[PDB]
Design a protein around this ligand. Structure first.
Ligand SMILES: *[C@@H]1O[C@H](CO)[C@@H](O[C@@H]2O[C@H](CO)[C@@H](O)[C@H](O)[C@H]2NC(C)=O)[C@H](O[C@@H]2O[C@@H](C)[C@@H](O)[C@@H](O)[C@@H]2O)[C@H]1NC(C)=O
Ligand SMILES: *[C@@H]1O[C@H](CO)[C@@H](O[C@@H]2O[C@H](CO)[C@@H](O)[C@H](O)[C@H]2NC(C)=O)[C@H](O[C@@H]2O[C@@H](C)[C@@H](O)[C@@H](O)[C@@H]2O)[C@H]1NC(C)=O
Ligand SMILES: *[C@@H]1O[C@H](CO)[C@@H](O[C@@H]2O[C@H](CO)[C@@H](O)[C@H](O)[C@H]2NC(C)=O)[C@H](O[C@@H]2O[C@@H](C)[C@@H](O)[C@@H](O)[C@@H]2O)[C@H]1NC(C)=O
Ligand SMILES: *[C@@H]1O[C@H](CO)[C@@H](O[C@@H]2O[C@H](CO)[C@@H](O)[C@H](O)[C@H]2NC(C)=O)[C@H](O[C@@H]2O[C@@H](C)[C@@H](O)[C@@H](O)[C@@H]2O)[C@H]1NC(C)=O
Ligand SMILES: CC(=O)N[C@H]1[C@@H](O[C@@H]2[C@@H](O)[C@@H](O)O[C@H](CO)[C@@H]2O)O[C@H](CO)[C@H](O)[C@@H]1O
Ligand SMILES: CC(=O)N[C@H]1[C@@H](O[C@@H]2[C@@H](O)[C@@H](O)O[C@H](CO)[C@@H]2O)O[C@H](CO)[C@H](O)[C@@H]1O
Ligand SMILES: [Ca+2]
Ligand SMILES: [Ca+2]
Ligand SMILES: [Mn+2]
Ligand SMILES: [Mn+2]
Lengths: 236, 237
């Protein structure tokens, strides 16, 4: 069984996407996860975008787990350097029919009141108490306290290409981050047993958030745009 | 106990490098692993380049294994599309004081007569009986029959950036291949227990080869140039 989709760009009312909270598609075809008014990103924003159809990551009958590969391009523009941009964006896999969780450093995927399991790859731009220096790429399993982390230098407003690959036979999740304009390459990998943390059917998508009001800083913001996205999964 | 070296270019007769067989450094500073005469790559060629000093990847006293990262840029130019360029190049780790092995699809690292252990990342351009479609990246452990493989499309004569990383805590060896002119990205990873296959001290370097005479095709060739190379390893204790 193989499932795959490709998005060279994004259109309004796209039927294959499920937009939640502040997420929306601009007229020039970009998926803006967090609020941007008149070219200016705002604080207190959270938004998600899920693929409309659930994907089967493993089968309880055969015990087999799926392998998958997803590539996407994003752009983070940080117009206000002081005091600190926030919060970042993530690619995540979660049970279907979930709802946006808490914003801020929780990226909109974690809900303390009723936590659901999830695997996520974060591009964290704000250093919370539980964080190492930012920006960093992090692999999260059921929590935003990354199992593995790697730092990177953001190309402010530039385009970033990401490749996430998961091999079921080795349980290796490897992610590659490239900034073509700068020619920089960052890589991180870890062992994650999907079958052990997630249910057979899941949703895949993105989530992001800007500074939470509790921080009392309106400058704690930045854009979180997704320019393209392709996904592929194979369940033998 | 970190160790690291960086070559942003290659000088004529590098005191830090050991060149074997056909490997040589051109006047414009590139490390040519296989023979090129008058701008034309030839067949029947094999060459290696090792860092002159051995590196310790693990310590029997503490049992600790080293983590490392290496980056390099290479370029493979294929002048003759038909009937099939050959053979490819590899980055390898082997016991010190070894000798060039068999050429052809063995890249110069495998010696059937007297095999020595090795871990290598290959960029294979010729499809041997044991190979999947080419070109492909492959992870080799003690043999050229890759444990893992992934295909890629070569940027003929272009520059390629490679990042190889090994994390001792997870035993994950991940390699990334990027062709900046094309913007293409390829990735592959696998679990490899260095401590279990290699000795405490090893050599790190490159090896490559062009078509073997047995193939009876002088067109089975291509260049195998290394443009730059940096290495870094951390052995806690
Ligand atoms: C952060 O954004 C939230 C919505 O994205 C704001 O809450 C919502 O505000 C709407 C307009 O005031 C209101 O109709 C909704 O009921 C409310 N949602 C709920 C129930 O929480 C949130 O704060 C609100 O709006 C500001 C302008 C003040 O009026 C507050 O008293 C509201 O709770 C925004 N945070 C802030 C303080 O900007
Ligand atoms: C939030 O972002 C604002 C826009 O960058 C900051 O103001 C800008 O500060 C610059 C020097 O840091 C100054 O050259 C710009 O003119 C100014 N832009 C405008 C029109 O606000 C702002 O910094 C604070 O406010 C400015 C006006 C100065 O008083 C600074 O000393 C203040 O820090 C940022 N606010 C915070 C809390 O950093
Ligand atoms: C080995 O590579 C050579 C260079 O690409 C091939 O010759 C070239 O073949 C072209 C058509 O394939 C032809 O337009 C070119 O004029 C010619 N170039 C030269 C320098 O000869 C060669 O192809 C074969 O051998 C040559 C001598 C011709 O007889 C071709 O028709 C043959 O296909 C390549 N060898 C093989 C066996 O493919
Ligand atoms: C393939 O490359 C080999 C070098 O690694 C050639 O080996 C030959 O080794 C001889 C022993 O020291 C040396 O004198 C020769 O110069 C050298 N090749 C030549 C002619 O330059 C090999 O050459 C073939 O095999 C040798 C043993 C002789 O019989 C030569 O006449 C043959 O050409 C190269 N083979 C081919 C197909 O070119
Ligand atoms: C958990 C969370 O959403 N944190 C966000 C918040 O960080 C805290 C802030 O709430 C308050 O407690 O002060 C501390 C520093 O003493 C932190 O800023 O706000 C920032 C933006 O200002 C960001 O959104 C965090 O993710
Ligand atoms: C093992 C080896 O080095 N093989 C090289 C050889 O490939 C084979 C050749 O052995 C013979 O059997 O013919 C077949 C095709 O029917 C292959 O060519 O030669 C090629 C060069 O053409 C290459 O160097 C192989 O790696
Ligand atoms: Ca954070
Ligand atoms: Ca081969
Ligand atoms: Mn984080
Ligand atoms: Mn191969």
């Amino acid at each position: 069984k193989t499932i795959s989709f490709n998005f060279n760009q994004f259109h309004q009312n796209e039927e294959q996407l499920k937009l939640q909270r502040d997420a929306r598609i601009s007229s020039n075809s970009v998926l803006e996860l967090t609020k941007v008014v008149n070219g200016v990103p705002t604080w207190n924003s959270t938004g998600r975008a899920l693929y409309a159809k659930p994907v089967q990551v493993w089968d309880s009958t055969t015990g087999n787990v799926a392998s998958f590969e997803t590539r996407f391009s994003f752009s983070i523009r940080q117009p206000f350097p002081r005091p600190h941009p926030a919060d970042g964006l993530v690619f995540f896999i979660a049970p279907p029919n979930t709802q946006t969780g808490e914003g801020g450093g929780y990226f909109g995927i974690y809900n303390p009141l009723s936590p659901y399991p999830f695997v996520a790859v974060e591009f964290d731009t704000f250093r919370n108490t539980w964080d190492p220096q930012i920006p960093h790429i992090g692999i999260d399993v059921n929590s935003v306290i990354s199992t593995k982390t790697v730092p990177f230098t953001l190309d402010n407003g530039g385009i970033a290409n990401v490749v996430i690959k998961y091999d079921a036979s080795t349980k290796i999740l490897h992610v590659v981050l490239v900034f073509p304009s700068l020619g920089t390459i960052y890589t991180i990998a870890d062992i994650v047993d999907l079958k052990q943390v997630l249910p057979e059917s899941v949703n895949v998508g993105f989530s992001a958030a800007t500074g939470d009001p509790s921080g009392k800083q309106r400058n704690a913001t930045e854009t979180h745009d997704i320019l393209s996205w392709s996904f592929s999964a194979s369940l033998p």
